[PDB]
Write a protein that binds this ligand. Structure first.
Ligand SMILES: O=C(O)CCCC[C@@H]1SC[C@@H]2NC(=O)N[C@@H]21
Ligand SMILES: O=C(O)CCCC[C@@H]1SC[C@@H]2NC(=O)N[C@@H]21
Lengths: 121, 122
C-alpha cells in the first residue's frame, strides 16, 4: 500500500518511516524528537488492507518499544489511528505510552496523547 | 523470552496467543469474545527485551487490525501495557480501538478501555 508507505513527521518533529505490506503489516523505524530516546527504534503494526472506499480513513496502529542499541527507556508506545489519503495525506493518532513500573507505581505507568503525522513527498 | 510467550486470556474471555522474540518482537493471533469479530486475527507488537533490574514490569504493546478471511470491521486496536512475571503472571493493559471514519466523525472514532490478561483458561 503506496498510500501509507513512506516517511512521516509529527508535530513534535519525530520521524516515522514505514512500509505497508500487502498482508496488512506495518514495518519500519521511529525516531522521537522528545523523551528518553535517541536514534531509530523498530516499529511493527497492522493496518486495514481492504478499507471502505467511502471517504473513511484507514484504521491502523503500531508499537515502538523504546530499546535500541543506543538506549533503553523500559517503556513502549502504541499509536492507534487512521490514515487519511489524498494529496495532503495524514495519520491522525492517539497514543498510550506505558513504562515498566513496580506494582506500587502501576497507577502512574501510562501516559496518553495524540499525534498527527504528515507525509513527506 | 519464555514468560510472555504463551496463551493468554482476558476478563472478557478473548484469547491472545503470542510469541516473544529474543530481539523484542511480539507475534501472534487474537481472538475477541466480543465486538465485530470472529475467529483469529494477526497481531504484531514489541516489548522491552532487557527490562529493569528492580522488579519493574516489562513494557510492551501490540496491534490487531480487525480484518481476516471472515470479516473486516475497518478498525484497529492497540494494547499498551506491561508484563508482570512471577507466580500468577499478568499482562495489564490499556487499549485504543480506532474505527475508520469520515473526518466529520473523527471525534467519535476511538474507544478506550483496559484489559488484564492471565494464562488461566476460561
Ligand atoms: O521517554 C520514553 O519513554 C520514550 C520516548 C517517548 C516519546 C513519545 S511516544 C509518544 C510521543 N510522540 C512522539 O513522537 N514522541 C512521544
Ligand atoms: O468491534 C470491532 O471493531 C473489532 C473487535 C474489537 C474487540 C475489542 S479490542 C478491545 C477489547 N478487548 C477484547 O478482547 N475485545 C475488545
Amino acid at each position: 500500500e503506496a498510500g501509507i508507505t513512506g516517511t512521516w513527521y509529527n508535530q513534535l518533529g519525530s520521524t516515522f518511516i514505514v512500509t505497508a505490506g500487502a498482508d496488512g503489516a506495518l514495518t519500519g523505524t521511529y525516531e522521537s524528537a522528545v523523551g528518553n530516546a535517541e536514534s531509530r527504534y523498530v516499529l511493527t503494526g497492522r493496518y486495514d488492507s481492504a478499507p471502505a472506499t467511502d471517504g473513511s480513513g484507514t484504521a491502523l496502529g503500531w508499537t515502538v518499544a523504546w530499546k535500541n542499541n543506543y538506549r533503553n527507556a523500559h517503556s513502549a508506545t502504541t499509536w492507534s489511528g487512521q490514515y487519511v489519503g489524498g494529496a495532503e495525506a495524514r495519520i491522525n493518532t492517539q497514543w498510550l505510552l506505558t513504562x515498566g513500573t513496580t506494582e506500587a507505581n502501576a497507577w502512574k505507568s501510562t501516559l496518553v496523547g495524540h499525534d498527527t503525522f504528515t507525509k513527506v513527498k
